[PDB]
Amino acid sequence: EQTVQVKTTGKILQSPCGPIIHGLEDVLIKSTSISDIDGEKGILWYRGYRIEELARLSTYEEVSYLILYGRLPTKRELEDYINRMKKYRELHPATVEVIRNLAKAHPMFALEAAVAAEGAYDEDNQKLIEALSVGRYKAEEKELAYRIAEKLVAKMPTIVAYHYRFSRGLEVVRPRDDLGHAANFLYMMFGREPDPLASRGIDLYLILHADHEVPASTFAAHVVASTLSDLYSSVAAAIAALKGPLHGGANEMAVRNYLEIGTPAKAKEIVEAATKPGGPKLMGVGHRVYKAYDPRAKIFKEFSRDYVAKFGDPQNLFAIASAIEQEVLSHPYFQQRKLYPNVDFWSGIAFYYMGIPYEYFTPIFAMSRVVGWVAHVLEYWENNRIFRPRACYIGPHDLQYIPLEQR
Amino acid sequence: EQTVQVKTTGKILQSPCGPIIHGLEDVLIKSTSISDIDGEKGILWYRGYRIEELARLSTYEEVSYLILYGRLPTKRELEDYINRMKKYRELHPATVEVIRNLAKAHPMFALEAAVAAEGAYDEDNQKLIEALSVGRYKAEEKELAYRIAEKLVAKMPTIVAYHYRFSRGLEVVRPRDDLGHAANFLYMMFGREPDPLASRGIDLYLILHADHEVPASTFAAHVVASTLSDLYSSVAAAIAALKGPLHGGANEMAVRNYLEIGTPAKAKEIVEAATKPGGPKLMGVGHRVYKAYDPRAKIFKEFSRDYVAKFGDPQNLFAIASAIEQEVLSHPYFQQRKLYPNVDFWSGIAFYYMGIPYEYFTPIFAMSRVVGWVAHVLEYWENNRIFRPRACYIGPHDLQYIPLEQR
Ligand SMILES: [Mg+2]
Ligand SMILES: [Mg+2]
């Protein structure tokens, strides 16, 4: 037994067993080469590449390859990958039936259940499970794991879209091999090939949210994977965590708030009210890591501007958000505390205008982040260790059982 | 930002961001009053009561009440609880269809998906989700949470049994209101009221595995619950973790090993071989916490003795296990290194003889542990904090994007 000095910005709880870092805030679980953030400068990298470059020059197909494999693909590697992903988009009939049965339920339950279901009949997954059951994880198993990772990234939009269609009493729209990842998602949701601007927005969103820190969803994936449980189950657990209101829902709440506000003229007073104790907090402003404008927000804001330039801003969402942004950027309270817009400030606007129901916002985040989840699991598996935390017992000992009739 | 002293018996990895406690071994996440283990003396308590006393005088219905509510029930409370649990046993038709669709899959996938499915249409769950979405968790919500916790404990055996039946192409056997929790499970599995001794075995097993500090499955439930995700989703995540070979399988492997050994005469040579590197090693001998005979093992061994005294020991599992146990206990090596049998050394024997397939062993563990999982979640929710661990980036920055054709 040894003592370790752990730096945390979180709250510490007192216990007879020693201090407890509440929510293990800032506690390190591993080193990673997946993504990095410079919170002071407001820079995000995926596998060494700045998000600006990837958003500008790449696609979710290429970025997902980068996140999963650790480098940019060659032309042949990307072509083969795209073709594998296209083939993988379709779900097993049992999975589709699971989704159908959960058509009237919240989409996140359908995602959890569908991911587990799809994992149940995946032959590679079964093979990998057999291998890990005897502690074998060598070249062949790693190949299975990467194939499974690809499948999970490929299938997530299909699960989401199918649920959307069934939930609306619409006929399911199956994946089209001739469409890209983002375009095909919109096609599956709405049954028509999407406008290229709309497709670009989805692709950009997927790129921008592919990996970031170790939120509770990514952490859940690690804990499940740490027992050598399968990749599908690890992603299902990630989705279970993601559905909690403390993980996500900010981009939805930001849009609902903009609608409530109704007029950009209120921006100044809203921002002022947010500087006072008990005041309604501004959704998508401030960040635990970024003490600068979130680079993802800068990029998505520009996409949003393009979207409303083409399709209009009928609910004045972009106007309202823009007015609030300008007040946030000029208010000393926010400036002094380095509180800036984050990507959630903007990202729900296009979704809302595209006709994506609010309840599908978080599922779309899962569509993006699934690649980060699987890449994180595979990385942890390079040096796996089952998680074995503890609790401090403060209950009594040796209570005497009293017969039922005497209680 | 502050520095906290964290004690650990695990491996520490240094990083640019600080020390990494690999697997978060021994890292405190909360104070608890649910269960406690004295590994040196081989004592286990649930809510202050020794496991020996509970195994001797209680039932899973009463022990589950104890674990969930923190005290022993009065006669009226127990009667009412038992009746609620009986009412909750049956699954929603959508859940049954989910299980049917996964009939040919491994039961743990069915459990994960079925638990999510059941939570999807549970009205109480929906109401609790609504409340937590706006940060409300007061008396009314806690009442919902406990109702949901009871449902999860009540339903787990139904899910398991229905999957078993469907996996064998049989019609489901719905829950019998006149049977106890353990007896009803056997009735649902096999379609006949069980022999009292078999029911006792199931009840005992359920009591004995109800909680055991904070393994990866219980931790997974915490991580998911920490986002204020729902109880069903938290349990589905716990199951996902439980499915991993590092979390279970030992009781099955012990039995397969006894079958391979075939003759108790080999006990001495097998145990002698285990004292050399390496090795092989004896299944269910030694424990990370118990440095004494696992109290659960002592109790379950005696039940197993009773079971084979009545029904026989046709595969000589008890004879083989007993021979090995005697050698382990008399060999100085094991005594000196505090290596004793743990519950896994014995617990698969009765199940095997009862006709429970190996793949249902871990599902039955889930039937037991679900009460610990839900109790742990509710406990955490008394002072919830979302888990916020982090990873330390090690790798390049500012790599230059190269056009596809030039790679
Ligand atoms: Mg522009
Ligand atoms: Mg006896």
PDB file of N, CA and C in Angstrom, chain A residues 55-83:
ATOM      1  N   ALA A  55     -11.953  19.615 -39.780  1.00  0.00           N
ATOM      2  CA  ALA A  55     -13.282  20.123 -40.109  1.00  0.00           C
ATOM      3  C   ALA A  55     -13.242  20.691 -41.518  1.00  0.00           C
ATOM      4  N   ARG A  56     -12.128  21.331 -41.843  1.00  0.00           N
ATOM      5  CA  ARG A  56     -11.974  21.952 -43.147  1.00  0.00           C
ATOM      6  C   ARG A  56     -11.762  20.963 -44.280  1.00  0.00           C
ATOM      7  N   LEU A  57     -10.930  19.956 -44.034  1.00  0.00           N
ATOM      8  CA  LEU A  57     -10.471  19.100 -45.115  1.00  0.00           C
ATOM      9  C   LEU A  57     -10.944  17.668 -45.122  1.00  0.00           C
ATOM     10  N   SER A  58     -11.563  17.241 -44.030  1.00  0.00           N
ATOM     11  CA  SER A  58     -11.907  15.842 -43.872  1.00  0.00           C
ATOM     12  C   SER A  58     -13.409  15.569 -43.891  1.00  0.00           C
ATOM     13  N   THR A  59     -13.759  14.319 -43.600  1.00  0.00           N
ATOM     14  CA  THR A  59     -15.135  13.840 -43.542  1.00  0.00           C
ATOM     15  C   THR A  59     -15.230  12.952 -42.309  1.00  0.00           C
ATOM     16  N   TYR A  60     -16.441  12.641 -41.867  1.00  0.00           N
ATOM     17  CA  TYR A  60     -16.533  11.743 -40.715  1.00  0.00           C
ATOM     18  C   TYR A  60     -15.925  10.384 -41.054  1.00  0.00           C
ATOM     19  N   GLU A  61     -16.070   9.924 -42.292  1.00  0.00           N
ATOM     20  CA  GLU A  61     -15.447   8.650 -42.648  1.00  0.00           C
ATOM     21  C   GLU A  61     -13.935   8.698 -42.377  1.00  0.00           C
ATOM     22  N   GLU A  62     -13.272   9.730 -42.881  1.00  0.00           N
ATOM     23  CA  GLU A  62     -11.834   9.837 -42.693  1.00  0.00           C
ATOM     24  C   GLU A  62     -11.438  10.115 -41.242  1.00  0.00           C
ATOM     25  N   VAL A  63     -12.186  10.989 -40.570  1.00  0.00           N
ATOM     26  CA  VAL A  63     -11.894  11.312 -39.187  1.00  0.00           C
ATOM     27  C   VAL A  63     -12.117  10.083 -38.279  1.00  0.00           C
ATOM     28  N   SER A  64     -13.176   9.327 -38.561  1.00  0.00           N
ATOM     29  CA  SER A  64     -13.431   8.125 -37.780  1.00  0.00           C
ATOM     30  C   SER A  64     -12.284   7.112 -37.982  1.00  0.00           C
ATOM     31  N   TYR A  65     -11.797   6.986 -39.222  1.00  0.00           N
ATOM     32  CA  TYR A  65     -10.648   6.124 -39.490  1.00  0.00           C
ATOM     33  C   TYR A  65      -9.463   6.626 -38.645  1.00  0.00           C
ATOM     34  N   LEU A  66      -9.217   7.933 -38.677  1.00  0.00           N
ATOM     35  CA  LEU A  66      -8.108   8.535 -37.923  1.00  0.00           C
ATOM     36  C   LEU A  66      -8.205   8.240 -36.428  1.00  0.00           C
ATOM     37  N   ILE A  67      -9.372   8.493 -35.849  1.00  0.00           N
ATOM     38  CA  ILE A  67      -9.564   8.253 -34.433  1.00  0.00           C
ATOM     39  C   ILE A  67      -9.383   6.770 -34.082  1.00  0.00           C
ATOM     40  N   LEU A  68      -9.940   5.893 -34.901  1.00  0.00           N
ATOM     41  CA  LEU A  68      -9.864   4.462 -34.619  1.00  0.00           C
ATOM     42  C   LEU A  68      -8.451   3.898 -34.799  1.00  0.00           C
ATOM     43  N   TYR A  69      -7.839   4.212 -35.932  1.00  0.00           N
ATOM     44  CA  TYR A  69      -6.552   3.621 -36.299  1.00  0.00           C
ATOM     45  C   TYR A  69      -5.309   4.410 -35.898  1.00  0.00           C
ATOM     46  N   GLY A  70      -5.482   5.701 -35.640  1.00  0.00           N
ATOM     47  CA  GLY A  70      -4.402   6.507 -35.127  1.00  0.00           C
ATOM     48  C   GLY A  70      -3.635   7.293 -36.162  1.00  0.00           C
ATOM     49  N   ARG A  71      -4.011   7.139 -37.424  1.00  0.00           N
ATOM     50  CA  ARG A  71      -3.364   7.877 -38.501  1.00  0.00           C
ATOM     51  C   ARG A  71      -4.320   8.056 -39.657  1.00  0.00           C
ATOM     52  N   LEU A  72      -3.948   8.939 -40.577  1.00  0.00           N
ATOM     53  CA  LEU A  72      -4.747   9.157 -41.758  1.00  0.00           C
ATOM     54  C   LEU A  72      -4.631   7.953 -42.687  1.00  0.00           C
ATOM     55  N   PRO A  73      -5.740   7.574 -43.329  1.00  0.00           N
ATOM     56  CA  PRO A  73      -5.682   6.452 -44.238  1.00  0.00           C
ATOM     57  C   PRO A  73      -5.065   6.794 -45.584  1.00  0.00           C
ATOM     58  N   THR A  74      -4.496   5.793 -46.233  1.00  0.00           N
ATOM     59  CA  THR A  74      -4.071   5.980 -47.597  1.00  0.00           C
ATOM     60  C   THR A  74      -5.354   5.952 -48.422  1.00  0.00           C
ATOM     61  N   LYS A  75      -5.239   6.283 -49.700  1.00  0.00           N
ATOM     62  CA  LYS A  75      -6.382   6.263 -50.596  1.00  0.00           C
ATOM     63  C   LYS A  75      -7.061   4.883 -50.592  1.00  0.00           C
ATOM     64  N   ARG A  76      -6.268   3.821 -50.743  1.00  0.00           N
ATOM     65  CA  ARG A  76      -6.794   2.465 -50.728  1.00  0.00           C
ATOM     66  C   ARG A  76      -7.434   2.094 -49.382  1.00  0.00           C
ATOM     67  N   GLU A  77      -6.784   2.467 -48.287  1.00  0.00           N
ATOM     68  CA  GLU A  77      -7.326   2.186 -46.952  1.00  0.00           C
ATOM     69  C   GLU A  77      -8.659   2.875 -46.752  1.00  0.00           C
ATOM     70  N   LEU A  78      -8.763   4.120 -47.202  1.00  0.00           N
ATOM     71  CA  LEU A  78     -10.027   4.849 -47.038  1.00  0.00           C
ATOM     72  C   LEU A  78     -11.132   4.248 -47.895  1.00  0.00           C
ATOM     73  N   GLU A  79     -10.815   3.901 -49.138  1.00  0.00           N
ATOM     74  CA  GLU A  79     -11.806   3.287 -50.006  1.00  0.00           C
ATOM     75  C   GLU A  79     -12.334   1.977 -49.418  1.00  0.00           C
ATOM     76  N   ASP A  80     -11.422   1.117 -48.977  1.00  0.00           N
ATOM     77  CA  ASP A  80     -11.804  -0.172 -48.395  1.00  0.00           C
ATOM     78  C   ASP A  80     -12.627   0.036 -47.122  1.00  0.00           C
ATOM     79  N   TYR A  81     -12.206   0.999 -46.312  1.00  0.00           N
ATOM     80  CA  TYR A  81     -12.916   1.314 -45.069  1.00  0.00           C
ATOM     81  C   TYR A  81     -14.337   1.787 -45.356  1.00  0.00           C
ATOM     82  N   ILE A  82     -14.468   2.711 -46.296  1.00  0.00           N
ATOM     83  CA  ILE A  82     -15.778   3.237 -46.665  1.00  0.00           C
ATOM     84  C   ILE A  82     -16.701   2.122 -47.149  1.00  0.00           C
ATOM     85  N   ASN A  83     -16.154   1.216 -47.955  1.00  0.00           N
ATOM     86  CA  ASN A  83     -16.935   0.087 -48.445  1.00  0.00           C
ATOM     87  C   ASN A  83     -17.341  -0.869 -47.322  1.00  0.00           C
TER      88      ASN A  83
END
